Amino acid sequence: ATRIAILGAGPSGMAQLRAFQSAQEKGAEIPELVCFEKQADWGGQWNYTWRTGLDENGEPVHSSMYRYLWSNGPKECLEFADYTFDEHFGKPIPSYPPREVLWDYIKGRVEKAGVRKYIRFNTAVRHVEFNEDTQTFTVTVQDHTTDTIYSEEFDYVVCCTGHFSTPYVPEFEGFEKFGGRILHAHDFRDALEFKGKTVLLVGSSYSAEDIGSQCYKYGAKKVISCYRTAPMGYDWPENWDERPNLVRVDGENAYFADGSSEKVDAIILCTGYIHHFPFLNDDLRLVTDNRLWPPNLYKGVVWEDNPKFFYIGMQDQWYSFNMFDAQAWYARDVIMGRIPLPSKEEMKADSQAWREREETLKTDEEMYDFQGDYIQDLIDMTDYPSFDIPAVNKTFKEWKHHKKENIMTFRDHSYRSLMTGTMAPKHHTPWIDALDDSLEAFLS
Amino acid sequence: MATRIAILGAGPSGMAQLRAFQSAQEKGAEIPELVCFEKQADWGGQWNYTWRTGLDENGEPVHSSMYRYLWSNGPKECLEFADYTFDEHFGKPIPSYPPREVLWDYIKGRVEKAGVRKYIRFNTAVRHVEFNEDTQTFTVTVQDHTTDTIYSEEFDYVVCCTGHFSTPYVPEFEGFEKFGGRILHAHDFRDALEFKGKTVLLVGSSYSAEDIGSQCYKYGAKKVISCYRTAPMGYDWPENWDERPNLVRVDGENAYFADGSSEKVDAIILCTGYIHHFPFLNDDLRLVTDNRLWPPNLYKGVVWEDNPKFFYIGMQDQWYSFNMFDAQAWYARDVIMGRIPLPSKEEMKADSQAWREREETLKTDEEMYDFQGDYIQDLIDMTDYPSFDIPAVNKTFKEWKHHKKENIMTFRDHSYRSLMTGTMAPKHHTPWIDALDDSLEAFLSDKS
Numbered sequence: 021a022t023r024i025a026i027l028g029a030g031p032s033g034m035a036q037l038r039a040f041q042s043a044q045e046k047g048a049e050i051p052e053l054v055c056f057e058k059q060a061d062w063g064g065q066w067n068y069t070w071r072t073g074l075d076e077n078g079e080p081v082h083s084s085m086y087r088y089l090w091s092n093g094p095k096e097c098l099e100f101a102d103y104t105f106d107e108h109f110g111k112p113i114p115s116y117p118p119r120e121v122l123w124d125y126i127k128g129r130v131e132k133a134g135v136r137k138y139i140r141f142n143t144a145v146r147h148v149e150f151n152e153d154t155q156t157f158t159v160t161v162q163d164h165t166t167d168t169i170y171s172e173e174f175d176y177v178v179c180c181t182g183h184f185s186t187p188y189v190p191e192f193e194g195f196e197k198f199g200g201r202i203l204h205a206h207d208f209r210d211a212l213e214f215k216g217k218t219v220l221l222v223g224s225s226y227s228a229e230d231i232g233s234q235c236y237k238y239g240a241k242k243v244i245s246c247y248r249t250a251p252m253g254y255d256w257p258e259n260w261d262e263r264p265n266l267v268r269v270d271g272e273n274a275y276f277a278d279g280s281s282e283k284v285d286a287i288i289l290c291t292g293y294i295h296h297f298p299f300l301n302d303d304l305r306l307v308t309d310n311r312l313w314p315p316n317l318y319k320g321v322v323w324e325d326n327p328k329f330f331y332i333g334m335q336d337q338w339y340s341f342n343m344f345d346a347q348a349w350y351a352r353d354v355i356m357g358r359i360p361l362p363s364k365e366e367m368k369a370d371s372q373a374w375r376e377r378e379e380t381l382k383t384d385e386e387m388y389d390f391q392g393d394y395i396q397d398l399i400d401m402t403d404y405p406s407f408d409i410p411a412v413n414k415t416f417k418e419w420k421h422h423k424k425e426n427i428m429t430f431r432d433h434s435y436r437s438l439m440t441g442t443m444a445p446k447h448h449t450p451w452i453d454a455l456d457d458s459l460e461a462f463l464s
Numbered sequence: 465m466a467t468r469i470a471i472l473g474a475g476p477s478g479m480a481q482l483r484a485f486q487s488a489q490e491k492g493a494e495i496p497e498l499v500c501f502e503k504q505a506d507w508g509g510q511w512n513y514t515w516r517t518g519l520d521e522n523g524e525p526v527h528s529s530m531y532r533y534l535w536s537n538g539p540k541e542c543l544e545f546a547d548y549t550f551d552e553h554f555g556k557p558i559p560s561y562p563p564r565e566v567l568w569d570y571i572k573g574r575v576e577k578a579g580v581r582k583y584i585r586f587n588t589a590v591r592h593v594e595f596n597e598d599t600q601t602f603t604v605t606v607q608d609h610t611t612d613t614i615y616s617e618e619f620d621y622v623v624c625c626t627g628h629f630s631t632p633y634v635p636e637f638e639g640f641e642k643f644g645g646r647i648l649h650a651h652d653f654r655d656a657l658e659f660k661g662k663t664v665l666l667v668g669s670s671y672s673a674e675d676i677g678s679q680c681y682k683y684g685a686k687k688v689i690s691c692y693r694t695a696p697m698g699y700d701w702p703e704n705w706d707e708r709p710n711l712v713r714v715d716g717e718n719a720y721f722a723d724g725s726s727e728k729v730d731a732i733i734l735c736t737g738y739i740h741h742f743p744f745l746n747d748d749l750r751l752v753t754d755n756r757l758w759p760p761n762l763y764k765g766v767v768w769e770d771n772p773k774f775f776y777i778g779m780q781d782q783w784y785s786f787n788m789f790d791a792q793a794w795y796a797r798d799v800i801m802g803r804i805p806l807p808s809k810e811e812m813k814a815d816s817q818a819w820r821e822r823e824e825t826l827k828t829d830e831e832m833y834d835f836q837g838d839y840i841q842d843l844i845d846m847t848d849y850p851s852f853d854i855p856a857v858n859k860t861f862k863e864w865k866h867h868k869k870e871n872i873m874t875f876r877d878h879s880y881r882s883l884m885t886g887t888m889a890p891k892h893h894t895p896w897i898d899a900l901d902d903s904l905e906a907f908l909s910d911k912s
């Protein structure tokens with residue numbers, strides 16, 4: 021029979037397994053599935069580790085998530101259309117859950133599906149090669165439980181390895197002289213390490229916003245964020261300064277493009293990530309900056325030069341979980357021969373139309389509107405449950421409004437489920453005072 | 465020549481392998497085409513310092529484990545090249561325990577003189593090495609991070625020089641997920657100043673624990689705790705350094721030891737050693753071993769017995785370092801060039817097994833560096849690598865061990881004689897404990 025390799029058991033790989041299991045329970049014959057995951061358990065980013073740098077096997081540490089992390093968007097925007105918050109939790113819960121609560125949710129769906137049996141944990145993907153002679157892929161992996169490098173042949177491969185794990189880590193003048201810690205956002209674990217300290221954040225996006233907010237919340241003496249082009253422009257607290265870009269450091273001080281300088285204890289590079297696929301040769305390897313429309317992907321998923329190779333979740337994310345579902349359902353239907361692909365020329369013409377639109381986008385609203393339209397096109401082609409994308413866009417609009425009103429209280433707001441219409445209750449504690457990140461403390 | 469060699473890495477071992485070939489060429493031999501792949505932007509391996517930790521600018525694991533303020537942990541006289549002396553490089557006597565930048569300068573000096581930088585492709589990560597039975601050649605696949613290109617080339621021989629002190633052994637202890645302080649491996653340690661006024665727990669009882677603890681002490685840590693798995697280090701530690709039996713668990717703030725004691729600690733540094741990790745090799749070529757004086761499956765400690773066109777340099781545990789890699793690289797060179805015909809697989813395994821049986825009996829430090837000295841003597845007797853006085857190096861290791869026992873904080877204040885030139889090292893202008901500036905300029909200057 022047909023054999024599929026699914027690379028990774030984060031949200032995307034979980035979605036890909038669930039997509040196949042959904043087709044099976046509706047009565048379809050599905051291919052043999054094998055999912056390779058280098059971590060010891062599923063959940064991808066959402067599987068928290070104290071580890072940084074390299075794991076116990078020598079593999080790069082995957083997760084970038086830290087203690088005290090909460091949902092940075094409304095949970096109502098990432099709800100599964102086939103497995104609601106109401107089904108999983110059995111009651112209304114607040115709109116910005118801590119990491120452990122969303123990890124519990126995503127695991128709940130695949131626990132229900134029974135798809136853990138397809139997953140080989142502690143197994144790092146080493147190489148994927150396409151064989152023209154057999155029209156099959158050789159997937160080579162390292163099983164760290166047995167310390168064995170082995171290969172198997174697959175008919176199709178679905179890459180679900182994420183793109184927020186391999187850091188973009190630029191050097192600044194004087195880093196070799198600096199007496200304090202220099203780390204990337206990827207390595208950040210515990211805001212308590214920076215209690216009573218002066219922390220410099222290099223960058224102006226989600227990691228700078230939230231790591232700065234955690235350092236503030238857990239008692240940093242001072243936060244400095246520095247921007248390359250434009251300030252973040254939010255209402256920062258009194259002990260948070262925004263500066264133009266870092267120019268250089270010395271033993272103790274950071275020097276900014278405005279000619280100012282001051283003592284800093286630690287530097288956190290919130291400079292984003294690279295798309296990194298060392299297990300792919302250039303015939304299969306996606307090369308892209310982080311963007312809403314990466315190139316060479318028909319419907320954002322099908323590798324145009326070899327359409328038996330698929331990528332899930334490689335777009336920049338406003339939508340996250342239910343985008344990966346729409347993609348996984350699409351990829352499943354292509355694999356199962358339910359969606360015949362057009363010619364390479366027709367695929368490229370379709371992708372180019374989406375690219376041309378992506379190139380014009382300016383505002384946050386234009387961006388989540390584009391991604392909503394993309395997902396609508398995907399769900400129109402499969403049996404993934406329809407959901408109210410314009411209502412989700414309106415929720416993103418409210419969220420963006422709440423961040424502008426007050427960047428420290430946006431998580432104190434509640435939104436309505438677009439799947440069930442359930443209104444989220446207000447949490448028992450305002451975010452700034454909610455020090456305990458535990459599922460037990462949140463659901464109490 | 466019509467054959468081509470891939471050398472994986474441009475640390476001391478890969479530099480030695482290039483120098484071995486260049487030495488044969490300047491003496492009038494025809495040598496093979498050489499290609500050396502190095503993922504860093506410059507040569508030196510461990511000795512090339514970086515502020516970076518975890519993953520580098522290209523997403524490759526950061527290689528170097530070296531830190532600010534690192535000095536030679538053995539006498540430089542024990543690692544001197546037999547073909548390129550300290551006297552030749554520096555033009556004067558220098559003290560016996562140079563800072564990192566000074567030994568980096570030295571190792572670079574030899575390959576600068578040799579002109580072998582032209583063979584090296586920097587910023588290039590080795591991804592895969594496969595042996596092809598059909599052509600009896602290796603396909604080496606690499607990622608050139610300068611151009612972001614993955615390409616493959618065919619090689620007749622491969623010499624693996626990628627080290628084994630870079631991929632950390634990082635065991636989890638009960639409660640690590642709860643602990644509110646930093647947890648890092650020795651591999652990630654960069655700057656003792658980060659621990660000034662802090663209580664630092666070191667897990668481990670070998671060189672990394674000794675030296676990282678010594679740096680934390682020197683640069684003003686409040687307290688050092690070192691914990692041992694089997695036996696204490698047993699040195700004369702300063703008053704703010706405690707030795708405990710092994711860590712059992714941690715909570716939010718405290719470390720709990722096997723003696724039933726516990727105390728609040730600010731940071732935990734795992735000084736738990738390293739793993740031999742070769743993700744670019746399939747199991748037919750991949751060395752699997754613990755850190756030891758005699759890793760298995762290596763004839764003369766260098767020739768992969770299942771495929772003797774594949775070689776490993778420097779994969780042994782190290783008393784000897786630079787001149788061991790030279791002895792090995794000269795041997796591998798002579799096998800590649802057909803100067804040393806190999807015995808049958810059965811004869812190679814019988815020779816390796818004799819060395820293994822001896823290795824298994826070793827107990828004392830002296831038995832260990834004596835074994836490694838005898839190993840190196842066997843290698844150098846088979847090639848034109850300049851003979852050097854191995855018993856005199858062993859005697860220097862013995863003096864060094866004696867100096868560490870007398871006073872672990874002042875062993876670096878002693879001087880030894882070059883076994884290559886007979887030059888006596890002068891006393892440094894500053895005692896180690898007060899020598900806060902690690903720069904080559906500060907070390908080679910005359911002012912204290």
Ligand SMILES: Cc1cc2nc3c(=O)[nH]c(=O)nc-3n(C[C@H](O)[C@H](O)[C@H](O)COP(=O)(O)OP(=O)(O)OC[C@H]3O[C@@H](n4cnc5c(N)ncnc54)[C@H](O)[C@@H]3O)c2cc1C
Nearest residue numbers: 028030031032058064065082091092145181182184333340
């Ligand atoms: C710090 C951080 C916070 C975030 N917070 C939110 C949030 O609040 N809300 C939200 O909607 N989204 C958030 N995201 C976005 C995040 O990308 C998605 O939520 C989701 O985790 C992406 O799922 P994925 O499966 O595509 O990738 P990942 O979650 O990265 O999972 C990829 C999986 O592939 C495995 N893998 C990778 N390489 C290999 C290999 N070679 N061999 C084997 N296995 C491999 C990994 O170990 C991992 O399990 C956050 C991202 C980051 C980095």
Ligand SMILES: Cc1cc2nc3c(=O)[nH]c(=O)nc-3n(C[C@H](O)[C@H](O)[C@H](O)COP(=O)(O)OP(=O)(O)OC[C@H]3O[C@@H](n4cnc5c(N)ncnc54)[C@H](O)[C@@H]3O)c2cc1C
Nearest residue numbers: 473475476477503509510536537589590626627629778785
């Ligand atoms: C912290 C520390 C301190 C030390 N101090 C001393 C000392 O004072 N005295 C002493 O004698 N010895 C010391 N050593 C021992 C050390 O092993 C040797 O000095 C020497 O650096 C070993 O050289 P090598 O070339 O075998 O390996 P390395 O120095 O580790 O060099 C390996 C090279 O391979 C490259 N490489 C690795 N993987 C790849 C890949 N996939 N693709 C491409 N290139 C790759 C690396 O980037 C590097 O250039 C120390 C070791 C450590 C870890």
Ligand SMILES: NC(=O)c1ccc[n+]([C@@H]2O[C@H](COP(=O)([O-])OP(=O)(O)OC[C@H]3O[C@@H](n4cnc5c(N)ncnc54)[C@H](OP(=O)(O)O)[C@@H]3O)[C@@H](O)[C@H]2O)c1
Nearest residue numbers: 090091092190222223224225226227230248249290291292
């Ligand atoms: N749940 C949470 O609270 C949380 C926390 C952290 C991250 N995340 C998630 O993680 C993902 C990644 O977010 P991210 O902000 O890490 O990455 P990102 O969105 O790709 O942000 C990249 C940032 O790096 C900056 N940058 C790049 N090079 C720079 C340089 N040389 N100097 C200064 N700044 C530089 C960019 O500035 P320019 O704009 O000038 O290019 C930009 O601000 C997102 O999905 C996010 O939601 C979530």
Ligand SMILES: NC(=O)c1ccc[n+]([C@@H]2O[C@H](COP(=O)([O-])OP(=O)(O)OC[C@H]3O[C@@H](n4cnc5c(N)ncnc54)[C@H](OP(=O)(O)O)[C@@H]3O)[C@@H](O)[C@H]2O)c1
Nearest residue numbers: 535536537635667668669670671672675693694735736737
């Ligand atoms: N120039 C310098 O100053 C400097 C500094 C750092 C390192 N180095 C070099 O780096 C190399 C490696 O030295 P290293 O000490 O890092 O590694 P190493 O010699 O392999 O030592 C490993 C240590 O980890 C301990 N260990 C392993 N697992 C443990 C566990 N679960 N709990 C507690 N302890 C555990 C071992 O204890 P057991 O003995 O009980 O097994 C041993 O003490 C050497 O070449 C060294 O010279 C040099």
Ligand SMILES: [Cl-]
Nearest residue numbers: 048049356358
């Ligand atoms: Cl069907």
Ligand SMILES: [Cl-]
Nearest residue numbers: 278279280281
């Ligand atoms: Cl000012």
